[PDB]
Structures are given as C-alpha cells and as structure tokens.
Design a protein around this ligand. Structure first.
Ligand SMILES: C[C@@H](C(=O)O)N(C)C(=O)OCc1ccccc1
Ligand SMILES: [Cl-]
Lengths: 305, 301
C-alpha cells in the first residue's frame, strides 16, 4: 500500500535530450531518429520576442547557425524547418537511443510526466495535469524551455508537451510536439493570462477511490445522487461537469471498491458543501485533482514498462 | 518559478534493475558492475518467515538456485555472500549500464527518489523522506522488494535505500545498500511497529522559505522567538526539535530572503496555532515536510 504522486520512469526520454544553441539563446532539444525538435523562439533575440517574424527570422538562418550538442558530441545540422511553433533540425545521425514513440495531443484533465532539463541535461521528473485552462502548474527555471512531457503505454513513449514559456501567475504554457499551443497563448513577449481555472471532477473521484483502496474511508456515506443533481453543485463550486463518459472510465474503481460513482459523488457533494472537518485524505487537506482514473488503476495494480 | 515534488531522473537506475528468483519467490535486484544486490529474505520459504536462520538457509543454496534475469537475458551466478540483510550475487557479466555510483546511509529528514519496480521492470518514480521514526511513506505492492531509493548529485548515483517490508500501519522499512536496517526493524515477520512519527521541522521551514522565494508572504509575522521557546511550542504539535545545526543549515535561505531563521520559526508557531484559514502555501493546505533545505535551493532560482 501507500499512494504517491508518481512519474513514469524517465530513462527512455533522458536518452533523447540535447542542448540547442542559436546566437546567445541556449535551450533543450528532443533528438528522435534524425530530427531535433525545440521551440522556434530559440532563433529570437530580446528585441525579436516583442513582435517576432519567425518565417523571416528563420530563412535568414543557416544550418551552422544551430549548435546541437548530445553530451560532449556535436551533431551536424543538415536541414532546418518550422512546423507551427516548433523548430525541426535535421541532423546527419539518427539517435541510436531513439525509443518506440509517437506524438500525441492530450485533453485538459489528462496527466503526464515532465522531464525538467537545463542545457540538455535531465534535472528532475514530476507528474503534471493539463489544467482545464490549458496551463500546467510546473516547476521551471530559465533554460528549461524545450523540456518535454510524456506518457508510457507498454514500451511506447507518447510525447504530448514541450515547454515554451512562464505566465505572470507562475503557471506554464507550451505546445504538443507538432507545435500547436495548449490554450489561447502565443510565443511572443506580450501580456497573457490563463482563463480562470476549474477543478478536474473525474480526477478528484479517482483520488477518493485511491484513498478507499488505502483504507481511508471516513468520507464515505449511505447517500447516492444523480449527474444532474451533482453537476448543479459541481458548477457552483467551479468543478468540471461530470459526463457519463467520466462515470464509465471510473467503472473499474467503482466495481473494485463496491462504491458506485454516484455513491462516491454523494461523498464529494458533502466534502464541497461541508469541508473535511479537520481531517485529511491520503495526507492532503485539499481535494487532489492531478490523478486520473488510469493513474489510480496503474499505481494500485503495479503496472510496469 | 513553480514548486513541485520533483524526483531525480530514473534512467541511470532503470539500467541496473533485474529480477531475482529463489524457490517460488521473485523480487528485484540491483546490478552494479559484477554484483546483484537484493533483500536476503528472497531465500525464505513459507515456514521461514517468523525466525529465519539466514546463515543456515544460505549455506544450503548453490549459485544455480538463484535465477537472475536482466530483461530477456539470464545472468549466470558465480558466487553468493550475505552482508547484514543484503544478499550479494556475483555474476559473470559486469552491467554495461552501471553508472558512477556510491552507497550512502542517510539520516532522518533526508529525501530521495524511489524507482518502484515489479519483476525487475520499473513502474514509476517518486520522492520520499526518511521519517524521524526511520520509516518511509512509500507506494509499494507485493513484488516491490529490492526497489531502491537514490539521489543523483552531478552524474553520480548515491544509493541510500533498498525496500524490504511493509509494517502494519502501511509504512515501509528497509536497509542501506550495506544491508543495515534504518530503525529498530528486522527482516522477520514477527510483530513490529514504528515509533510515533513526528514532522521534520527543518524541512517545513525550508518549504516556508521556498514559498517566500515564490512570492508568498501572507503567513509572515513581525515576531521572533528563542530556539528554546520554539521547541517547547513545536513539540506540542509532534514537531521534531530544531537544533542549532538545523538553524545553520537554513542560513543561505535566510540570507536570500532577508528573513531570520528565528523570525521564520515565529511564523511556523503562528501557522500551527491558526491553520491556513482556507488559504494554501505552494498548492498545499498542510505544512509540507518532505523538502530539505538542499532540495529548496536546487529547485529555486
Ligand atoms: C536494528 C534492529 C536490530 O537489533 O538489528 N533493532 C535495534 C531492533 O530492535 O529491531 C526489532 C527486533 C530486534 C530483535 C528481536 C525482535 C525485534
Ligand atoms: Cl543524510
């Protein structure tokens, strides 16, 4: 037993991380097959970032304007192109450590592991959720740009996130690996703020299932409810609406604990309207919403990669 | 900016994890150079759980009673010895993925990453502290024995923990990589319980310093305290005593924020008296005690 915020093992991604330098900007690249992926803003100066013309800035650049370093080894860039807000640098060598991977775009509410890197050196790994407002509550310092987020499904790495910027609230914004931003953000130095955030309902329920599986049971009760009834309380408390898709996804945890989702919803309705009355769940005084149902099944059944 | 429970990148440890089978028992081992380290309880049977005689069970094994698998490959055991509660199997192949490593025994309050493994394959990585009562609050299922805890400071992996068992309260006990248990525990299924657990006071102060560096000031107050009056209050909340060593260690966070260690102690006394009043600090509605002064400086600008 026990229940922790748990990241995927990061080894398959550590072997893909490189340093990319253009002018005075150094940040991180993802080296897969014979291509290095990084944020297009690497090619920008300070003056550029205010109103950047990336098309124009990039055609001006040549292959030797990009220094790609994998440890103490220089990669030769033999091509450079842009896809949305990601730069692709073709190199003369395929990464012999390239894992089985694909590029995936995640939905708000889904979780992933971030490998925080500096100058192409992996530094730390943590579990994040894509917030309903398309920010992540990350931990990033200067030089963390191009750090990536991923899941693992068997032996396949699904890359879902690349770090581009910090917002003035301390939350973080970035793209999928095809360069499409998550959320209404742009890669220019301008005034941007996250739409007010909301709580990921189906994840709070998954965490209450993890608590019950670990013998934290005090919050259970004789009551049940309906989606409509619950979603009226949910709307009121800035919780996401709970769909029938969400109730199906919790099916496993519902059956494996003999608590039906709407029975557990009855427990959540009461926690929002009353509080925890001085108590904790799994050593939190908050309702935790960064564990998906899959996360809870994986951690409590001992799934391996 | 941002503040997160952050583990070390697990790749250097992943390439060292193998599966060790003895009899019908399978758990994880750690393959470094030409040695595989694992909990010695792998050599117990169902009647040996309470009072195993390890020296007696071990002398009855040959090298070929040990099945060691590194992915698809079977390794060949050419030797076996016991050091305290750790079994060491000499194998004919050095691990080509062996990183720079050392073994270090940590003190209560220290943090490390755990690579939770099953059948020699990694499931996940998370951050832990050694509790003042020499347990860890891990996430471990049956088959996770031999999973290790580690720090990575500058390309070198310091192994500090190997998982041996779960106590009845659901907390975890294990050894250093020399096989010496943390705390008053033995590798026997005789009834054992941890001492009452306390909060790691120095770690709470480090985390309050991190909150200030990230632009939180709502919990600060105009008061200071003596070290003695602080300990008299804190202990009434099951807080660890704060020592002058603990004060010294917070020096750099004190310097970087311009808040004195004993001013921050006054803040903590007040937070204990009032709670958070529905507010949060760095995302938590509890006071977090699993970040060290060293972790806070490494993660903070
Ligand atoms: C560290 C450990 C030890 O004696 O090796 N220790 C101090 C300890 O009290 O472990 C519990 C125990 C020891 C002997 C008999 C029953 C239970
Ligand atoms: Cl230590």
């Amino acid at each position: 037993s026990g229940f922790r915020k748990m990241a995927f093992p990061s080894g398959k991604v550590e072997g893909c991380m490189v340093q990319v330098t253009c002018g005075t900007t150094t940040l991180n690249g993802l080296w897969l097959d014979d291509v290095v992926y990084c944020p297009r803003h690497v090619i920008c100066t300070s003056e550029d970032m205010l109103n950047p013309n990336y098309e124009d800035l990039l055609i001006r650049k040549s292959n030797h304007n990009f220094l790609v370093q994998a440890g103490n080894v220089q990669l030769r860039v033999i091509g450079h192109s842009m896809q949305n807000c990601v730069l692709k640098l073709k190199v003369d060598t395929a990464n012999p450590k390239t894992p089985k991977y694909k590029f995936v775009r995640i939905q708000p509410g889904q979780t992933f592991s971030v490998l925080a890197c500096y100058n192409g050196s992996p530094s730390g790994v943590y579990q994040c959720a894509m917030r309903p407002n398309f920010t992540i509550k990350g931990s990033f310092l200067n030089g963390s740009c191009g750090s990536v987020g991923f899941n693992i499904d068997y032996d396949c790495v699904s890359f879902c996130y690349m770090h581009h910027m910090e917002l003035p609230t301390g939350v973080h914004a970035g793209t999928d690996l095809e360069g499409n931003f998550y959320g209404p953000f742009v890669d220019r130095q301008t005034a941007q703020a996250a739409g007010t955030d909301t709580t990921i309902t189906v994840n709070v329920l998954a965490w209450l299932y993890a608590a019950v599986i670990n013998g934290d049971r005090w919050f259970l009760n004789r009551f049940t409810t309906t989606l409509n009834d619950f979603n009226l309380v949910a709307m009121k408390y800035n919780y996401e609406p709970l769909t029938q898709d969400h109730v199906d996804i919790l099916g496993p945890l519902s059956a494996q604990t003999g608590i039906a989702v709407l029975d557990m919803c009855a427990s959540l309705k009461e926690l929002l309207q009353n509080g925890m009355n001085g108590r904790t769940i799994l050593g939190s005084a908050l309702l935790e919403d960064e564990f998906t149902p899959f996360d809870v099944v994986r951690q409590c059944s001992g799934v391996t990669f």
